[PDB]
Amino acid sequence: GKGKPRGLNSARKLRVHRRNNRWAENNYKKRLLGTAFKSSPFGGSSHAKGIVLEKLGIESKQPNSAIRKCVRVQLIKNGKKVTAFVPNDGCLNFVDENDEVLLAGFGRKGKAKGDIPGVRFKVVKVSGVSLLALWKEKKEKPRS
Amino acid sequence: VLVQDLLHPTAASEARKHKLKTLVQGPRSYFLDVKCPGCLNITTVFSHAQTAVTCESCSTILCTPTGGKAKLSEGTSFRRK
Amino acid sequence: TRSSVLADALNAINNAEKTGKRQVLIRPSSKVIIKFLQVMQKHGYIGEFEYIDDHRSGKIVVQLNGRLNKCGVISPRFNVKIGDIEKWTANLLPARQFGYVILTTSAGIMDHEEARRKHVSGKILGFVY
Amino acid sequence: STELTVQSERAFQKQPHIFNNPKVKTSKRTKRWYKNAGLGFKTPKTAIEGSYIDKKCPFTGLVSIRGKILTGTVVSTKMHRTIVIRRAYLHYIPKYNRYEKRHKNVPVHVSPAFRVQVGDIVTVGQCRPISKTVRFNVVKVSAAAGXXXXXXXXX
Amino acid sequence: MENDKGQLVELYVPRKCSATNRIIKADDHASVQINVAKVDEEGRAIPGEYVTYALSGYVRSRGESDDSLNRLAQNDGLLKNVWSYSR
Amino acid sequence: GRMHSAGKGISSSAIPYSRNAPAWFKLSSESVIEQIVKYARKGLTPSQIGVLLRDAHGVTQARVITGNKIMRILKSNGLAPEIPEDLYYLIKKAVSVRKHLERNRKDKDAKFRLILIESRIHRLARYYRTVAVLPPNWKYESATASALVN
RNA sequence: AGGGGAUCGAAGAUGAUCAGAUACCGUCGUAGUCUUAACCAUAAACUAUGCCGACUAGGGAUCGGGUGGUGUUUUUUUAAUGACCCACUCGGCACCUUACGAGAAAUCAAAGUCUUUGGGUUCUGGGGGGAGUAUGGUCGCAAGGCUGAAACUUAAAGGAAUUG
RNA sequence: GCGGUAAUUCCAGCUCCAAUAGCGUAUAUUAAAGUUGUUGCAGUUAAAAAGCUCGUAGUUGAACUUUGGGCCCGGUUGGCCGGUCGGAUUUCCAACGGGGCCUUUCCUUCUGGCUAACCUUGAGUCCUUGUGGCUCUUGGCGAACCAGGACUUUUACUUUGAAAAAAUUAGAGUGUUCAAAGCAGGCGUAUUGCUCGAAUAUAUUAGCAUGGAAUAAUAGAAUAGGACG
RNA sequence: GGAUAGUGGCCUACCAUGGUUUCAACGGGUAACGGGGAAUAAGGGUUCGAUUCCGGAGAGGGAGCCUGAGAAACGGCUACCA
Numbered sequence A: 001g002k003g004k005p006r007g008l009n010s011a012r013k014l015r016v017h018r019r020n021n022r023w024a025e026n027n028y029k030k031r032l033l034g035t036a037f038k039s040s041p042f043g044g045s046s047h048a049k050g051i052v053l054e055k056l057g058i059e060s061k062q063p064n065s066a067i068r069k070c071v072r073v074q075l076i077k078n079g080k081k082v083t084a085f086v087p088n089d090g091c092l093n094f095v096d097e098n099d100e101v102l103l104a105g106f107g108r109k110g111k112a113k114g115d116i117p118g119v120r121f122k123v124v125k126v127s128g129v130s131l132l133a134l135w136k137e138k139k140e141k142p143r144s
Numbered sequence B: 001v002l003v004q005d006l007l008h009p010t011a012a013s014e015a016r017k018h019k020l021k022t023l024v025q026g027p028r029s030y031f032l033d034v035k036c037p038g039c040l041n042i043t044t045v046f047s048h049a050q051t052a053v054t055c056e057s058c059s060t061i062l063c064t065p066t067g068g069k070a071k072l073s074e075g076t077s078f079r080r081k
Numbered sequence C: 001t002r003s004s005v006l007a008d009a010l011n012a013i014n015n016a017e018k019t020g021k022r023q024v025l026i027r028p029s030s031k032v033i034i035k036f037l038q039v040m041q042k043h044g045y046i047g048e049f050e051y052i053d054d055h056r057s058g059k060i061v062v063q064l065n066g067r068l069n070k071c072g073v074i075s076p077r078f079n080v081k082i083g084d085i086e087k088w089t090a091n092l093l094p095a096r097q098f099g100y101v102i103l104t105t106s107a108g109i110m111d112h113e114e115a116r117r118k119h120v121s122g123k124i125l126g127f128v129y
Numbered sequence D: 001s002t003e004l005t006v007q008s009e010r011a012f013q014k015q016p017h018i019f020n021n022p023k024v025k026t027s028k029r030t031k032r033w034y035k036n037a038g039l040g041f042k043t044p045k046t047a048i049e050g051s052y053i054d055k056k057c058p059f060t061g062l063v064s065i066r067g068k069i070l071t072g073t074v075v076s077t078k079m080h081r082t083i084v085i086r087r088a089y090l091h092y093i094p095k096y097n098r099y100e101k102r103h104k105n106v107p108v109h110v111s112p113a114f115r116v117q118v119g120d121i122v123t124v125g126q127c128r129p130i131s132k133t134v135r136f137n138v139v140k141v142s143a144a145a146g147x148x149x150x151x152x153x154x155x
Numbered sequence E: 001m002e003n004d005k006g007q008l009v010e011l012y013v014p015r016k017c018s019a020t021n022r023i024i025k026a027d028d029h030a031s032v033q034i035n036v037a038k039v040d041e042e043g044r045a046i047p048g049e050y051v052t053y054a055l056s057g058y059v060r061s062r063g064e065s066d067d068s069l070n071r072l073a074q075n076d077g078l079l080k081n082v083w084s085y086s087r
Numbered sequence F: 001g002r003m004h005s006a007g008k009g010i011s012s013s014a015i016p017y018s019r020n021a022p023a024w025f026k027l028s029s030e031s032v033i034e035q036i037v038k039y040a041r042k043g044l045t046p047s048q049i050g051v052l053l054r055d056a057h058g059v060t061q062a063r064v065i066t067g068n069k070i071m072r073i074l075k076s077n078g079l080a081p082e083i084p085e086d087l088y089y090l091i092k093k094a095v096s097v098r099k100h101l102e103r104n105r106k107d108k109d110a111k112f113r114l115i116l117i118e119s120r121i122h123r124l125a126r127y128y129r130t131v132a133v134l135p136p137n138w139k140y141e142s143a144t145a146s147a148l149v150n
Numbered sequence G: 001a002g003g004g005g006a007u008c009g010a011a012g013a014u015g016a017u018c019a020g021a022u023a024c025c026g027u028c029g030u031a032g033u034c035u036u037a038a039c040c041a042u043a044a045a046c047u048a049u050g051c052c053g054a055c056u057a058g059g060g061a062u063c064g065g066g067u068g069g070u071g072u073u074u075u076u077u078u079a080a081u082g083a084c085c086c087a088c089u090c091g092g093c094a095c096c097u098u099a100c101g102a103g104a105a106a107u108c109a110a111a112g113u114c115u116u117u118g119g120g121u122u123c124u125g126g127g128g129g130g131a132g133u134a135u136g137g138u139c140g141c142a143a144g145g146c147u148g149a150a151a152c153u154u155a156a157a158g159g160a161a162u163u164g
Numbered sequence H: 001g002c003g004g005u006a007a008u009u010c011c012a013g014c015u016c017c018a019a020u021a022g023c024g025u026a027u028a029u030u031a032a033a034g035u036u037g038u039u040g041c042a043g044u045u046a047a048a049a050a051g052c053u054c055g056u057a058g059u060u061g062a063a064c065u066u067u068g069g070g071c072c073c074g075g076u077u078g079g080c081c082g083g084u085c086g087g088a089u090u091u092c093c094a095a096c097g098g099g100g101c102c103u104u105u106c107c108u109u110c111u112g113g114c115u116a117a118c119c120u121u122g123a124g125u126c127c128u129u130g131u132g133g134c135u136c137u138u139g140g141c142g143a144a145c146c147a148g149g150a151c152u153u154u155u156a157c158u159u160u161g162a163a164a165a166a167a168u169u170a171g172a173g174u175g176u177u178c179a180a181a182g183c184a185g186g187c188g189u190a191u192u193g194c195u196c197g198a199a200u201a202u203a204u205u206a207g208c209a210u211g212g213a214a215u216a217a218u219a220g221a222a223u224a225g226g227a228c229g
Numbered sequence I: 001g002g003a004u005a006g007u008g009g010c011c012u013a014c015c016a017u018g019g020u021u022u023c024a025a026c027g028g029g030u031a032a033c034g035g036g037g038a039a040u041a042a043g044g045g046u047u048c049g050a051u052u053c054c055g056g057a058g059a060g061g062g063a064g065c066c067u068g069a070g071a072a073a074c075g076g077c078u079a080c081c082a
């Protein structure tokens, strides 16, 4: 019958053995340890606001080749140092150092996007006005 | 094969089969009534001694044990039932 | 060691039917074995059997036809709550129009439909289609 | 458990409001009292015969049995006048649709009107809070010993 | 496999090996249909009248086509002895 | 089957269908019973008795001509031994094996067999112990078994 | 820690070979190799295949045991023996041929009787690297054994078979 | 995976698609997932059988103990009729179940209270040549449960039921103009009121209550300290 | 015995050595109030519930209490820490 006790009272052995073997399940593992809440630059939440440190030009991974315009952000609620991205053409212009971005995940559950080495976040807003709108001239950056 | 009698099989193929693989199991050993004309009386003996059977009065012998059946001793006669 | 007498029985039958034959020698025959075969017969998935008596546990010689696909046992005789019967049938019966789940109730060893009529429940022994 | 002594305490032991008049020349010295508990557990003869007191006895004491009536198979008698039973059962987990062996140990009070050893099945019944943990009291021994004298020497 | 009222619906009620009584289905192109003709008074084979048998591919493969034939035919007359229902 | 070995040979007697009989067998319950008790008194195992009465004597199944297992006969005549026979022979063996180990500390295989034997001895002990035949306190020990058999 | 230390021989020293040659080949040869008293507890410790039981298909070999015989050969006076021959039956180590059947396949009388999915039971696995690492705990005289994570990274690693 | 000079991926213009007062994105989660596997996985080589054997806990564990036969009672569907002024019930019929008996057959047990039922029968007979049919007290049923005494081997499963909040949910009724909802509303003499409602289902593990007696346990008589009187 | 509205190691006194545990005690973690419930729709499951109803806990942290039928109350008082 291969392994599993088929008995009518082996219920314990079964519940227990399941638990024990769920511990090899990756999402179970992270959801119980609290890896979300311990590690991870974000608190475990969908976004997080922060401040620009330096503007970066990341050498793209292979077999591609470019220079991938980013920003080192220090998370406001956390002080954690996060290197994150400014998508679409231009956009790296809208930033400028010391600015106050709003950061989001890249949609990989951690884990980099494409040829961008080490980047797990992209920028959503700056100065409280969002890339999109700025990029498409729908809004205009605030004063100071 | 494919169709055959399980219930009533030939007492010929049953013959050669193992004592427990017969359609109902029973022994295959037997008894014999043994005589060595030195004395007057005959003694029952089991086909497989183990115990090297000695006679009723005279310290003679009768059969020595082996793997299987007893080798009956020397000049004896017998009868199966 | 020999665990479910029923199981060796059933398995012997199916292995025979698969292998084409018409008769099986099953060992070693319990009351429950009989009742199972009595139901199978009663619904004509086998023919006639015979409880040969050695002075032990017995043997049975089953004469079977060919109209039987699988007959089988459920290893941990699970309890069934009069509504979960429907569920079992659903799980292991090829359709809604034949093949019986056979079980053990307080009012006897019977097929799921007979049990359905008599309206009694208990544990589950197996199935035949 | 008690055994012997009866008057073995710093306090005098006696039944409450059961005056025995010394002016009157009795034949039984101590006038006793008792009842039957109910539901059909005969107030055994050892209770009426005996000399003990224990105001926690269900037959000679002033504690009424009511509520759950449970059985259980005694596993501890090392506590004076009280014991621990292990009531067992099978618990049904739905996911696996099966059972697992479970058990709990209830501490019950036991009047000396029952002699008990470990093994004996017992039938106890709920009374008021008797101790910190004793919520039950012994009412019938559905056993005897389990053949200890049929474990004797040799021929 | 009729239906609600009378009407025998669903085409093709297949053969059936009168050997195992399992179904001989289309792509059993290993099956067999044996025609044994009805003889009559002194030789003479009578075309156009057969006692016929079916033999599933399974059986023929297993080799049991022969022995089960012997039995099948005999119990329907055209063999005397040869085959023994016991061994 | 065959617990401690990985042996698997089947090797039992085949007991006859005829639960009574032999019909050709003469004598009496008296006869064989008397035989049993005497041999018992010669200090024999119920098995030694069964065999000795199988071969020389014409006793096919002592339990048949007398509806009583040999051992039960001996008990019902006060001849019942302190402990069952199988356990005796297990223990006896164990003791001898032990002796061989003490004489020969360089022998591993013996350590093994001793463990095995002993463990049969204990399982079995627990059995008998459970069915009244041995006191719920009975235990096997090396020191004491030494004397227990001899 | 004693004994022993012929043999081959980690280390080390060498003669050469190489561009180099801390090696392959040759020489010398320490520990070792063997044994007693005590630890260590790991191997591709391999059938890379848990244990008990049931059922399902053919073939000749062979080990053990047993049965069956007006079988062969051993001569002596026939036996008795032993060896051998043949049939059969338990239980062994394997091979063969098939394959109803199984599988990703190579192949497999189990790796079969599984979507027609339940005989009993122990254990292990849940992409790849990180890493058998870090840490604690425990065992050891040590070398180390057992227990044994995560952060991070990453879209393939991987197996069998085909064609080149 | 596109971009290193004619880019089906970028930046746009054109045109076209998808969803449309909505649509994108991040994070979490559930389905896909038979990648957590009780149902339902996998372990020769792809991830995975401890070097080996013993062994306690734990899970598991052969077969066998009232089976078969006979009679009685009355239910619910379905057929062939319908008698009737869409439904009806008798006789004919199968079929599927519920109950009680006699077979060597405790039903815990006495002591009255009770009787509903016939071995009764006391008359005879409505009426089809009569066991079709019930009213009917005087010898003769226990068990139907009263309540009092005396005692009771332990369990698992299963049945039915009691006890059981509403809101949620499944669901019935009702035309909030639809619908989400709401538990309203609908009839006239709309001049002095008529009136349907506000259902049912689930409610599981435990506990109580009740039928069952298969399957699986448990206890009993071997130094007879046995069983009935 | 004392205490309480009242049972009870609730407390005191004497007396004893007991109670729980591989059927997982005890300890640790909970980004944990418990339920009625929610989401996901073959089924079996998996995830969630702070949050309109029920129950419970608190009023910056604790402790103490007056009044009263009823509170260890905080839109009551007293003390300490903040």
Ligand SMILES: [Mg+2]
Pocket (backbone or CB within 6 Å): A024
């Ligand atoms: Mg792991």
Ligand SMILES: [Mg+2]
Pocket (backbone or CB within 6 Å): none
């Ligand atoms: Mg930097």
Ligand SMILES: [Mg+2]
Pocket (backbone or CB within 6 Å): D078, D079, D080, I016, I017, I018
């Ligand atoms: Mg004490």
Ligand SMILES: [Mg+2]
Pocket (backbone or CB within 6 Å): F001, F008, F010
């Ligand atoms: Mg065997």
Ligand SMILES: [Mg+2]
Pocket (backbone or CB within 6 Å): F003, F004
């Ligand atoms: Mg074993």
Ligand SMILES: [Mg+2]
Pocket (backbone or CB within 6 Å): F010, F011, F012
């Ligand atoms: Mg043997």
Ligand SMILES: [Mg+2]
Pocket (backbone or CB within 6 Å): none
């Ligand atoms: Mg060197």
Ligand SMILES: [Mg+2]
Pocket (backbone or CB within 6 Å): G022
């Ligand atoms: Mg070197």
Ligand SMILES: [Mg+2]
Pocket (backbone or CB within 6 Å): none
């Ligand atoms: Mg290893």
Ligand SMILES: [Mg+2]
Pocket (backbone or CB within 6 Å): none
């Ligand atoms: Mg073979």
Ligand SMILES: [Mg+2]
Pocket (backbone or CB within 6 Å): none
């Ligand atoms: Mg020979």
Ligand SMILES: [Mg+2]
Pocket (backbone or CB within 6 Å): G099, G100, G101
């Ligand atoms: Mg095959």
Ligand SMILES: [Mg+2]
Pocket (backbone or CB within 6 Å): none
């Ligand atoms: Mg198939």
Ligand SMILES: [Mg+2]
Pocket (backbone or CB within 6 Å): none
């Ligand atoms: Mg790539």
Ligand SMILES: [Mg+2]
Pocket (backbone or CB within 6 Å): H007
């Ligand atoms: Mg272009």
Ligand SMILES: [Mg+2]
Pocket (backbone or CB within 6 Å): none
């Ligand atoms: Mg474009």
